[PDB]
Amino acid sequence: VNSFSGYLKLTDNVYIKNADIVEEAKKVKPTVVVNAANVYLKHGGGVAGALNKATNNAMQVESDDYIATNGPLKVGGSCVLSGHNLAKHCLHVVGPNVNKGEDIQLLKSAYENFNQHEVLLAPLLSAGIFGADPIHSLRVCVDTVRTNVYLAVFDKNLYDKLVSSFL
Ligand SMILES: O=C(O)Cc1cc(Cl)cc(Cl)c1
């Protein structure tokens, strides 16, 4: 048993809700919240900007020191950093950004990072401003992640479309 409420069950291990991931993290304080990061960990917009704003920019300060030491992530890659006031840990995962011309085939690699963690609160990778087909992202998620994932989709109309079309 865990603390996630009102999620629709899609599969054995994937659950979904129409919710703001920031508000969900603040209420649940999960062990792991996933950030939809870029390779520079520049948390300007989207999920990353919203998570970072909720940490009062402490996520960005920590991330800048991570990059100064380690250099950028890979597309498809990840790193584990603090969850600050939102979670124990934040798993920063880089899904491909179609609007930057990154390879959509790296989405599966991105979701494989989730398998290193037993339970996660996560966004729908590569959707929204990332430019990929969300229906596709949800299919890759369910076909790749084996650990327990609670997806928090912000856009209402998108949530309804994803549930109605799910195979
Ligand atoms: O939750 C959503 O509506 C989809 C989405 C996913 C990501 Cl990763 C970023 C944005 Cl801005 C939006």
Swiss-Prot record:
Domain Macro: 1-167
Subcellular location: Host endoplasmic reticulum membrane
Activity control note: Inhibited in vitro by GRL-0617.
Origin: domain of life: Viruses
UniProt topology in membrane: Multi-pass membrane protein
Catalysis performed (reactions): Thiol-dependent hydrolysis of ester, thioester, amide, peptide and isopeptide bonds formed by the C-terminal Gly of ubiquitin (a 76-residue protein attached to proteins as an intracellular targeting signal)
Function summary: Responsible for the cleavages located at the N-terminus of the replicase polyprotein. Participates together with nsp4 in the assembly of virally-induced cytoplasmic double-membrane vesicles necessary for viral replication. Antagonizes innate immune induction of type I interferon by blocking the phosphorylation, dimerization and subsequent nuclear translocation of host IRF3. Also prevents host NF-kappa-B signaling. In addition, PL-PRO possesses a deubiquitinating/deISGylating activity and processes both 'Lys-48'- and 'Lys-63'-linked polyubiquitin chains from cellular substrates.
Summary of subunit composition and partner proteins: May form homohexamers. Interacts with N protein.
The name this protein goes by in its record: Papain-like protease nsp3
Species of the source: Severe acute respiratory syndrome coronavirus 2 (2019-nCoV)
Gene name of this polypeptide: rep
Included stretch of the parent chain: 1025 to 1191 of 7096
